From a paper:
[name] (At) carboxylesterase 15 (CXE15) and carboxylesterase 20 ([name]) have been shown to deplete strigolactones (SLs) that coordinate various growth and developmental processes and function as signaling molecules in the rhizosphere.
Similar to AtCXE15, the overall structure of [name] is divided into two domains: cap domain (residues 1–26) and the catalytic core domain (residues 53–327) both of which are also connected by a long linker loop (residues 27–52). Strikingly, in contrast to AtCXE15, the cap domain of [name] comprises of NT α1 helix and anti-parallel β-sheet (β1 and β2), which we termed NT-α/β. Notably, the presence of F31 and R307 in [name] may hinder the proper orientation of the ABC-ring of SLs and their dynamics resulted in larger pocket size (from 303 A2 to 620 A2), and can explain reduced enzymatic activity. CXE15 demonstrated much greater activity towards YLG hydrolysis than [name] with kcat values of 0.84 s−1 and 0.021 s−1, respectively.
Residue numbers in the entry: 6 to 70, 78 to 326
Write the structure that this text describes.
Amino acid sequence: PIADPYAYLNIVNNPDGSITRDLSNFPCTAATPDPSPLNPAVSKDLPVNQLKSTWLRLYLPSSAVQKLPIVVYYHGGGFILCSVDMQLFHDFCSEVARDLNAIVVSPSYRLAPEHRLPAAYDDGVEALDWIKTSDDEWIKSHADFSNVFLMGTSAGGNLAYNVGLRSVDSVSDLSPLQIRGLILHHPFFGGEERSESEIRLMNDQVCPPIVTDVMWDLSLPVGVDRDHEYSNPTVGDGSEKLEKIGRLRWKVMMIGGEDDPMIDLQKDVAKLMKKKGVEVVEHYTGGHVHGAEIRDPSKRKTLFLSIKNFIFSV
């Protein structure tokens, strides 16, 4: 059982409210714009916001270099760790582009505690503003603006959900982008009281509650606890934006693993969405730990096939 969450996360507390991250465990890799048989996608980097130092990586199936659906992908890491150019996420997004036959837009976002929530959400929203006005040749030649999906893994799935909530009152300004769906891949949600699955899976070795407590403590706004809507979408009666999501027919795909301590809350978020009139496609798998398909590439294909079916289903 994980005894020390900070050592598990490879972080140290710093006397100004920051943390020191040991990056050596997660190597980064560069974009590769020229097609290569070793690379499932071509990729390139573009800046978004100079003040925030935010940017994004574009991915295109090697074959593309007949417009493709736009999958905006937000990476995971508890809102406190990890980057777009981490090999782990770069390889995943490249295979997403190839196997969905999609253009994948993977935006960076600022990390907590240096930039607590809702900073990441603001950055996730700004990435859509960027797509809408981009003159980039890959966007202009290959991106189907009518078929936008907001995707994310773990914290990125929480991020994608909250970008969806923030876009619902903004749909006029999103044009010529049209959002069709949200794809929530093991989204990072937690509450104050332990859920049934957090108790049952208390000794998880991937993302146990002792570790997520730390991540929420570092990323939530100063002064709030885990029953805030940022971490727990079910508090009260959920957002008053879910019914609108349902009326606009944005579909939501909720992907969860049954050995993830987060699973009870993830399933209850899907229930709430359905009660609010959202069309929810649920994809739950026994024996899968948090981030299963990130850590095990041999699980990716059937996930990608289900996502492709979801995308075609709109």
